[PDB]
RNA sequence: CGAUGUCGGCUCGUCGCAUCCUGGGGCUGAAGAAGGUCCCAAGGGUUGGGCUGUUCGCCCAUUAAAGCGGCACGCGAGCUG
RNA sequence: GAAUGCCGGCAUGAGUAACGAUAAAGAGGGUGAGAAUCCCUCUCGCCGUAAGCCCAAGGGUUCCUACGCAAUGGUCGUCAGCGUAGGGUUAGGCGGGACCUAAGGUGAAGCCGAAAGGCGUAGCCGAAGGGCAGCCGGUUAAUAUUCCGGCCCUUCCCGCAGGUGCGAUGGGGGGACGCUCUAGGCUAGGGGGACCGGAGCCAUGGACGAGCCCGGCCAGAAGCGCAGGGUGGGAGGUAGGCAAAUCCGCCUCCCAACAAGCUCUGCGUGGUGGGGAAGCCCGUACGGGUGACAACCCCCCGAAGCCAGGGAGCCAAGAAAAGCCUCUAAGCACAACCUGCGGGAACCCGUACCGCAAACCGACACAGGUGGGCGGGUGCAAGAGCACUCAGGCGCGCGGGAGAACCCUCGCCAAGGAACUCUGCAAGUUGGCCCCGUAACUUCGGGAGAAGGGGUGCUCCCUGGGGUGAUGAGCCCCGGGGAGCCGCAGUGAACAGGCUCUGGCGACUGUUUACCAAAAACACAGCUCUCUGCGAACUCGUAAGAGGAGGUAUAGGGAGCGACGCUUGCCCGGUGCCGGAAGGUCAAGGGGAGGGGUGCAAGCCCCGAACCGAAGCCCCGGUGAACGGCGGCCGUAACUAUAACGGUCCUAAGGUAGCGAAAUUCCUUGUCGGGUAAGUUCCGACCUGCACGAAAAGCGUAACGACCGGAGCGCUGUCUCGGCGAGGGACCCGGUGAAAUUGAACUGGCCGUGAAGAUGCGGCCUACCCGUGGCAGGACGAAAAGACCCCGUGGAGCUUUACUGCAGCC
RNA sequence: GAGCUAGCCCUGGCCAGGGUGAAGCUGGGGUGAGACCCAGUGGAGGCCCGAACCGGUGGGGGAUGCAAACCCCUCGGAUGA
RNA sequence: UGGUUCGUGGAGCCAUGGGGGAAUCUGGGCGGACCACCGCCUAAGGCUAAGUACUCCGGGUGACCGAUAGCGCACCAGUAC
RNA sequence: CGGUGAUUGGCGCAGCCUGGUAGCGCACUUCGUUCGGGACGAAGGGGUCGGAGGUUCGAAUCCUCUAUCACCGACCA
RNA sequence: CCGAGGGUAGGGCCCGUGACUGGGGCGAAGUCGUAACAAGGUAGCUGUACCGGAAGGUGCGGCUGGA
RNA sequence: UGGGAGAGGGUGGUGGAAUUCCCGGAGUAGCGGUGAAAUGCGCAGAUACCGGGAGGAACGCCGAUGGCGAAGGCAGCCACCUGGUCCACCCGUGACGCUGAGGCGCGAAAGCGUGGGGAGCAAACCGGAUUAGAUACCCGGGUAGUCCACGCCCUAAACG
């Protein structure tokens, strides 16, 4: 049956992208607190 | 006139559909229509602020002169009367002699090929707009302003009417299809004859599908909830409501007047509803 | 109570006897046939249905008889539910 | 040494269950160190509205090739979607961007907010929608509408040549639209052929035959031809399209009223370009040649696709902007634009491979899930159904034997047909089409497929209609009559209702607890009450703002009841709500009588009574489809019995109609009647209603129901009452090989005892050691620190006339 | 965090094949005119049978499963809420 | 209303949201209600090092650890998953 | 089996907590009216206060305990 | 082929019967009330609708079989 | 052909008196009601009076033993549409007529469905008096209904 998980490209770059962070006074500080902690990517990697 | 069905299923024994003989004219002028965005009960914030809407038919808003001192003196044509999804009324399309085409909304027994003016000038038959203050005493009237210059807000769905009651003042008393007696000021336009369509009211939907194609969702009984979400719900039975009758977010139903005490317009309305 | 799954039915039995029947007997207000009561006796047997979830019980048609209880009111790592 | 402790390691179950759809395998020959598992050939089985092709999303090297098998593969492996290496994705025309707008997002102007931030017109972003110029073949091991070949188009930019006032992001037109049903003509596609082109073949009794078998196409400018879509043409006047217009819109006489004419598609033909089986010979796995100088012809069925913006009907009344045409504005009129020709310029990203699946989402090469297109043939009335089968793809990544119990999934059964059981649960009976015929009841539609029947195959003869054809043959679709044939049986296989009587509830289609409840619950049309005069009420929000609504009392919100039929009685004393400029009470504030603290005093500073002081409460009325409520005890009538009647107490009034052992009845299996041989259920009544009752509706109601109850017919392995048979396991052999659990174990019975249910204590009895296939009585067996109970001054969710606050409103 | 799920908004697509045969038209009958009654045509419906598609009724299997909701038979809707 | 030890208390003082609303040395604030006396400061503009807090970074030292310890990482670790 | 209420003229009821009194309505009964009876009108009677015990000077009335009487509850398995 | 007749299935009519139920009639001299006949003490009757233990009352309209 | 009357029917429109309610002025301690009272209304300013406004129904005098219609029934006034009818002239047709089972249409009031309207009155209901009792008569309130449009219902002491 249908799971969770049904990608898309499109709906993960525009809600979890490096642009849709930077709108939100929130998602700047998860790129804060993800420079801090050594992240190799700060968001999820999207073709 | 209202068309009757016989029961080859279930639910067209009481189905009731509306007599289209006054109708001309089967698509609208291109010129006037705009889309209407449709909300959902939706408003900016994306939240339902009026619930159980959504759904149903598509809709292009036929856009009506309601505020008709733009062309005083200058008579007009009709040459077709109309649906309006947007409506209980019918629509009547005018031509003017001016050579713009409007619509106003057609009042009863207005036929199709009549010249028809507005103005103070303005004779005193139906379809015409005048001030109130020129209009005669008794007269039935629809497509009423309430404050001067400021757009027909008044008695304008389908088979309403005021009538004028008296003057006094530089306002006249109008008899509102609620009933109310109430003060409009005498330069409020104000478009004669009672609206029509007046078979509207006995309309009888017949299924509940019917109410889905105008938008109307399922409404649910406060009694069949849960006492979260309505103060009458809960109850290891059938309840007999607990409490004085009651709103989702705990106004009572039963009677409790709600009009704003202090409201300004309340020095203008002499007699209330009925 | 860091778990002993509960009523009834199905399947499978097994035991006690304070015995329903068959067997042996004493008394009888036991003429005979059939009964009643008590004693000895468990070796074996103790039907099929209608109602009800029923155990129980009330009926139907039979029977030699249509016995009472224990086994975690036997039996759910056997079933049903 | 213990914490169901943490981490790591290794054991036990154990060579145990399992090895992932019961679609199915066998042989021969190669390769190889090693073959059931790799390659090749033959035979067999499976899919074939897919288990076959093409897209899209997603995945991201998995594609191809050479060399390999440690690990991955539920076995093996020489193989691979695996390891190393090399190669492979070519575009002006396909998709996306230098085009447009939708929901929505952002957002100068502007509004708001302690800050962060929230709105927001224009504009911008935003696409499986609109717009836009490429079709068919051939090559690669791997790409092609991309390279090559042929034929055909689009933008720009520059030149000549010929026309016109050119000219905007501005005005107008168009783009531009729903659902259902459809006409004419085409096409895709398919069937037949005595005609044509073909390597070949007469087998086993017969046949050299109009025999069998294979194939008889594709694209293609202009110009024709055939269907079809869009549109009227001139003249004036003009105050509207936010400047101006010759445009558009509105009038007024004239010409057709038509597709006549203009364009624009589609389809045939078209210069010419290409393709071209079956069989045989082969050298590879994948392909090549010949067959071929190939033929490339004629009928028939025919779409849901095309002409397309076709037509008709209906209500629920069905996107926007750009491209395109036209009109003018400044500006420009040595420009600029339009048509034809010629030359030149045409950028960025994707393209491979999987793609109903071993490459996507499910930790797995997981029986699950995944959007669009093509989906051939025959037969069954039709069909995308069912059975078989082209093309094509497969035999599902452990096998070999055996022929126990037991399990699963099937097949059949004497006599009985529900005796089984909570219940005919399950399985069986019936089953499609044609034709007779069809009840109570009813809202006249239904009930209806009621029920119950008859026919169904094949051959021959006569005969009536259509469509294409020229009114005719042929080809296709429908019929009728007569005679006969065979079998147990003719929808001969597969797909395909068991029926009837009655009651409860809900009117009905529908919705729901994803993952134990699909229902009598929700919703529903419909009825009523109530609020709301528009900057409406209500809702979200601090606000701005927005929904309501670009709606206006025939409208919007809240509440209840839930089609329809007949109805909805009495109580307003308490609660709620509605209406009352009286009065009682009531805070800040006003007011200051009077008194006090200091000062030598002017002064400075405090309390402070009358009195004026809103809402609200008290008070006064109304209000039940508002919250709610709707009695008790005595006596009395020509037998008893009962009470129409009366007396009395109380209430705010004391349950009316209609139902009633009911989804409501404790006593209770109430008591009668029907069904039955027998009926705690069912049906019909009586009323003694613990404890029905009128919109938390009352009583009925045709139809409807995977709802619940009762009965009967048909039919059966449900049963008496079992028996046999089939296949996938279980059993044996070879390969791989878990798990929860486990204090350690050298782990018998009875009677006792022991914290009261003992393999372990006592007495006695029994008992050589070790396994295998089975059964479950025990190990108070396993699993989950009981989920029922109680405790904790534990926690949440809900409620109110509990307390105390806040929002909100006055 | 609405890539599952619930609702709504914008833009697209899908629903083989059969039945039943409403309104409305045309002709005839009828009447003063009607209402109305016959045929024929017509093709409506939260209509019917039933594949795709959407569900999940009853039973059997499965229960360290093919699967942390499955499989087989059976069944509901299938032009519409 | 907030701050202060100050929870309305005898509640001053310091800041304030709202209403009223002066003066310029004979002016004004304060010394814990208030008054008198006696004293101390000169509000409604602003700037001002040092002495003080911390350790991403470099160095020194340790009755700190020694690969289940020590930072989560001694090892290409905020990685694999 | 628990709880808290009632028993009073023939009948259905008030009377109490504030300890002395026992009353209303119907009924019964004598009279009056009408031809007779009923309604009316005038006059009258009517009590173990269920019974046992004490608290005091004194109980229907206050407190115990019995016997009937309706009435509520009997819950979680 | 037809065919007396038998069988299956479903309808139409009639008769007897049926727990219980409704009204009707006749009964002994029962209970409750006074509706109507006299202006029957509210003139009566009537079609209809509503209500009441009951005759009956009331609303609407009508009638003279009363003034 | 030419005259005449009439509440004959349908539609649209309009006028005045009066009842109720609202508003304003003024005004007091009672008004209604009965057989008598009471319920009830009323110093929260009623009845009574004046002025203004809204709404509904019926149209006094004319008016009666009148007129019209087939019956039910029909009443302010105006217009339109329309039916029946009476007289005269003796012109036309020329026996065309009478009745009429069915059928068809009309059919007071009450009642029903849908929508509207609702001043007065008033079944049901609620009070207050009468009475032995009152589900009635009397009094005070009061919902359907009475009114309109459409469609039903088809009755009567529809009687002369
Ligand atoms: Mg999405
Ligand atoms: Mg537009
Ligand atoms: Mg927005
Ligand atoms: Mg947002
Ligand atoms: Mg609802
Ligand atoms: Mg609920
Ligand atoms: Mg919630
Ligand atoms: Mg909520
Ligand atoms: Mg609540
Ligand atoms: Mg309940
Ligand atoms: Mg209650
Ligand atoms: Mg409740
Ligand atoms: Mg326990
Ligand atoms: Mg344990
Ligand atoms: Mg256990
Ligand atoms: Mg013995
Ligand atoms: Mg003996
Ligand atoms: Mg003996
Ligand atoms: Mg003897
Ligand atoms: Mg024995
Ligand atoms: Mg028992
Ligand atoms: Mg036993
Ligand atoms: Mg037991
Ligand atoms: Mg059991
Ligand atoms: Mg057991
Ligand atoms: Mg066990
Ligand atoms: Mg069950
Ligand atoms: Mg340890
Ligand atoms: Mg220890
Ligand atoms: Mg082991
Ligand atoms: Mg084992
Ligand atoms: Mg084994
Ligand atoms: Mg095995
Ligand atoms: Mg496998
Ligand atoms: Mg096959
Ligand atoms: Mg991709
Ligand atoms: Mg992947
Ligand atoms: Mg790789
Ligand atoms: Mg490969
Ligand atoms: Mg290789
Ligand atoms: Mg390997
Ligand atoms: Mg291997
Ligand atoms: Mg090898
Ligand atoms: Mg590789
Ligand atoms: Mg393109
Ligand atoms: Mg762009
Ligand atoms: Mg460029
Ligand atoms: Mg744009
Ligand atoms: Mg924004
Ligand atoms: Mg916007
Ligand atoms: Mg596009
Ligand atoms: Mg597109
Ligand atoms: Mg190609
Ligand atoms: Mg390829
Ligand atoms: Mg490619
Ligand atoms: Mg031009
Ligand atoms: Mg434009
Ligand atoms: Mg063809
Ligand atoms: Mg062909
Ligand atoms: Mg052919
Ligand atoms: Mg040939
Ligand atoms: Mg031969
Ligand atoms: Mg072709
Ligand atoms: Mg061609
Ligand atoms: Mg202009
Ligand atoms: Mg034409
Ligand atoms: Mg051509
Ligand atoms: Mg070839
Ligand atoms: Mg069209
Ligand atoms: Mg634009
Ligand atoms: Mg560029
Ligand atoms: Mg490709
Ligand atoms: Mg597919
Ligand atoms: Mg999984
Ligand atoms: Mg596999
Ligand atoms: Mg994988
Ligand atoms: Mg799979
Ligand atoms: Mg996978
Ligand atoms: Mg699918
Ligand atoms: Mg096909
Ligand atoms: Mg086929
Ligand atoms: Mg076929
Ligand atoms: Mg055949
Ligand atoms: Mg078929
Ligand atoms: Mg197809
Ligand atoms: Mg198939
Ligand atoms: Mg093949
Ligand atoms: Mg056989
Ligand atoms: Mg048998
Ligand atoms: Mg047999
Ligand atoms: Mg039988
Ligand atoms: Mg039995
Ligand atoms: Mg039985
Ligand atoms: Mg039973
Ligand atoms: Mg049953
Ligand atoms: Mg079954
Ligand atoms: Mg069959
Ligand atoms: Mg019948
Ligand atoms: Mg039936
Ligand atoms: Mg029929
Ligand atoms: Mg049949
Ligand atoms: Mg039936
Ligand atoms: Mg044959
Ligand atoms: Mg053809
Ligand atoms: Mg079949
Ligand atoms: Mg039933
Ligand atoms: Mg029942
Ligand atoms: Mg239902
Ligand atoms: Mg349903
Ligand atoms: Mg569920
Ligand atoms: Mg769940
Ligand atoms: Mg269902
Ligand atoms: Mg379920
Ligand atoms: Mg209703
Ligand atoms: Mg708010
Ligand atoms: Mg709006
Ligand atoms: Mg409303
Ligand atoms: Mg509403
Ligand atoms: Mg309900
Ligand atoms: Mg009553
Ligand atoms: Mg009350
Ligand atoms: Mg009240
Ligand atoms: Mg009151
Ligand atoms: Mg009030
Ligand atoms: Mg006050
Ligand atoms: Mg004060
Ligand atoms: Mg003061
Ligand atoms: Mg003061
Ligand atoms: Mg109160
Ligand atoms: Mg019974
Ligand atoms: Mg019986
Ligand atoms: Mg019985
Ligand atoms: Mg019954
Ligand atoms: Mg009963
Ligand atoms: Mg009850
Ligand atoms: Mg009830
Ligand atoms: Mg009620
Ligand atoms: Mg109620
Ligand atoms: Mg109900
Ligand atoms: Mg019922
Ligand atoms: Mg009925
Ligand atoms: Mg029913
Ligand atoms: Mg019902
Ligand atoms: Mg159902
Ligand atoms: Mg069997
Ligand atoms: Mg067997
Ligand atoms: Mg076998
Ligand atoms: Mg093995
Ligand atoms: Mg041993
Ligand atoms: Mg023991
Ligand atoms: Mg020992
Ligand atoms: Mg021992
Ligand atoms: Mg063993
Ligand atoms: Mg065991
Ligand atoms: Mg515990
Ligand atoms: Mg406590
Ligand atoms: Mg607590
Ligand atoms: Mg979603
Ligand atoms: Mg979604
Ligand atoms: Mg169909
Ligand atoms: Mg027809
Ligand atoms: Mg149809
Ligand atoms: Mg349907
Ligand atoms: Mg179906
Ligand atoms: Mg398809
Ligand atoms: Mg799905
Ligand atoms: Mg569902
Ligand atoms: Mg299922
Ligand atoms: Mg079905
Ligand atoms: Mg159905
Ligand atoms: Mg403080
Ligand atoms: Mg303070
Ligand atoms: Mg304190
Ligand atoms: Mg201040
Ligand atoms: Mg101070
Ligand atoms: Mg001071
Ligand atoms: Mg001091
Ligand atoms: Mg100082
Ligand atoms: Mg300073
Ligand atoms: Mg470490
Ligand atoms: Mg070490
Ligand atoms: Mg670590
Ligand atoms: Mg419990
Ligand atoms: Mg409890
Ligand atoms: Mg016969
Ligand atoms: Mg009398
Ligand atoms: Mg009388
Ligand atoms: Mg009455
Ligand atoms: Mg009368
Ligand atoms: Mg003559
Ligand atoms: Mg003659
Ligand atoms: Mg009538
Ligand atoms: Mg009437
Ligand atoms: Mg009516
Ligand atoms: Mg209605
Ligand atoms: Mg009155
Ligand atoms: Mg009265
Ligand atoms: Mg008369």
């Known amino acids: 049956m249908k799971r969770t998980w049904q990608p898309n490209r499109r709906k993960r770059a525009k809600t979890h992208g490096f642009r849709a962070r930077m709108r939100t006074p929130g998602g700047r500080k998860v790129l804060k607190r993800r420079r801090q902690k050594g992240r190799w990517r700060l968001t999820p990697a999207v073709r | 006139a209202v068309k009757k069905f016989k029961p080859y299923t279930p639910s067209r024994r009481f189905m009731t559909v509306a007599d289209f003989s006054e109708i001309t004219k089967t698509e609208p002028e291109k010129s006037l229509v705009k889309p209407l965005k449709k909300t959902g009960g939706r408003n900016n914030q994306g939240r339902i602020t009026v619930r159980f809407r959504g759904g149903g038919h598509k809709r292009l808003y036929r856009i009506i002169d309601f505020k008709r001192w733009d062309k005083v003196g200058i008579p007009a044509k009709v040459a077709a009367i109309e649906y309006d999804?947007?409506?209980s009324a019918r629509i009547a399309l005018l031509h003017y002699v001016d050579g713009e085409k409007r619509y106003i909304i057609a009042p009863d027994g207005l036929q199709v090929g009549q010249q028809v003016v507005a103005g103070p000038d303005a004779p005193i038959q139906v379809g015409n707009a005048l001030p109130l203050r020129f209009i005669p005493v008794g007269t039935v009237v629809h497509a009423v302003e309430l404050e001067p210059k400021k757009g027909a807000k008044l008695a304008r769905a389908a088979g309403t009417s005021a009538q004028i009651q008296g003057r006094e003042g530089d306002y006249v008393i109008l008899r509102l299809p609620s009933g109310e007696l109430r003060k409009?000021?005498?330069?409020?336009?104000?478009?004669?004859?009672?609206?029509?369509?007046?078979?509207?009211?006995?309309?009888?939907?017949?299924?509940?599908?019917?109410?889905?194609?105008?938008?109307?969702?399922?409404?649910?009984?406060?009694?069949?909830?849960?006492?979260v979400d309505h103060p009458h719900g809960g109850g290891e039975g059938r309840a007999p409501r607990g409490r004085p009758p009651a709103s989702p977010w705990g106004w009572q139903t039963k009677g409790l007047k709600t009009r704003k005490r202090r409201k300004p317009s309340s020095r203008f309305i002499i007699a209330r509803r009925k």
């Open chain 2, 184 to 227: 409009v000021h005498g330069e409020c336009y104000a478009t004669v004859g009672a609206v029509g369509n007046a078979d509207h009211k006995n309309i009888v939907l017949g299924k509940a599908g019917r109410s889905r194609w105008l938008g109307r969702r399922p409404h649910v009984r406060g009694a069949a909830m849960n006492p």
């Open chain 2, 85 to 87: 999804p947007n409506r």
